[PDB]
Amino acid sequence: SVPSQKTYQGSYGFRLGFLHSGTAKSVTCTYSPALNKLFCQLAKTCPVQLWVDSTPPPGTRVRAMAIYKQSQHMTEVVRRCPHHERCSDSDGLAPPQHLIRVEGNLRAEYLDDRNTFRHSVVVPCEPPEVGSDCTTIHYNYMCYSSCMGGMNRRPILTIITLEDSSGNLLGRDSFEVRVCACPGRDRRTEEENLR
Ligand SMILES: [Zn+2]
């Protein structure tokens, strides 16, 4: 099967937000609204904002999962390549096979689906810090888009779902991801191509 990628705000008005980081050659993570695509370096912090219109119930959670963007690859589980799954760069919580990690959240849980074999990482939905209007989750992507035997140059999407305590759907959003050495240059290039 294939997880849905349909944008759905739901009862709570759920959607994502991204910082405006620019495209200098030194940038480590940058988001393109025109492409709905995040460009980031290997294992670097990717701040993703969560926005809602109203407060969801206690026990609400936020899950991230990657899928291949191209239909002919959609049924294939997105996972780390044969090199990176064995490089012992564990943070003590994320399984070494998982592409997406959450940084600095001890309540993060990593799922290997018993039926689809797909990977995801899920955290409790938390209110903004005092003085802030949204909550930020810090993600890491642990393989390059180009990794042989892994993504192998195939584009992926990250799907973020807002879930109730049973795992039922409350909201959904998504964005394409390219993990690369020079996010600034590649974003500039792909945006120029689009024009
Ligand atoms: Zn890799």
UniProtKB/Swiss-Prot annotation:
Outcome after substituting N36D: In a sporadic cancer; somatic mutation
Region Required for interaction with ZNF385A: start and end of each range?
A: 5-195
Q: What is the effect of changing A94V?
A: In a familial cancer not matching LFS; germline mutation and in sporadic cancers; somatic mutation
Result after altering V52I: In sporadic cancers; somatic mutation
The outcome of changing G150R is: In sporadic cancers; somatic mutation
Q: What is the effect of changing H73Y?
A: In sporadic cancers; somatic mutation
Annotated phenotype, changing Y139S: In sporadic cancers; somatic mutation
What result is annotated for mutating D53N?
In sporadic cancers; somatic mutation
Q: Give the result of H84Y, as annotated.
A: In LFS; germline mutation and in sporadic cancers; somatic mutation
Q: What is the effect of changing M148T?
A: In sporadic cancers; somatic mutation
Name the consequence of K37Q.
In sporadic cancers; somatic mutation
- Result of mutating H138D? In LFS; germline mutation and in a sporadic cancer; somatic mutation
Record note on what altering W51C does: In a sporadic cancer; somatic mutation
Effect on the protein of changing Y31N: In sporadic cancers; somatic mutation
Q: So what does mutating N140H actually do? A: In a sporadic cancer; somatic mutation
Please tell me, according to the UniProt entry, what happens when changing C29Y: In a sporadic cancer; somatic mutation
Q: Effect of altering K69R?
A: In sporadic cancers; somatic mutation
What result is annotated for mutating H98Y?
A: In sporadic cancers; somatic mutation
Q: What is the effect of changing R80G?
A: In LFS; germline mutation and in sporadic cancers; somatic mutation
The reported result of mutating Q41R is: In sporadic cancers; somatic mutation
Query: Impact of changing S165P on the protein?
Result: In sporadic cancers; somatic mutation
Mutating Y31D leads to what result?
A: In sporadic cancers; somatic mutation
Mutation effect (G59S): In sporadic cancers; somatic mutation
Phenotypic consequence of S54P: In sporadic cancers; somatic mutation
Protein name per UniProt: Cellular tumor antigen p53
- This chain's source organism reads Homo sapiens (Human)
Which gene codes for it? TP53
Q: Parent protein range shown?
A: 96 to 290 of 393
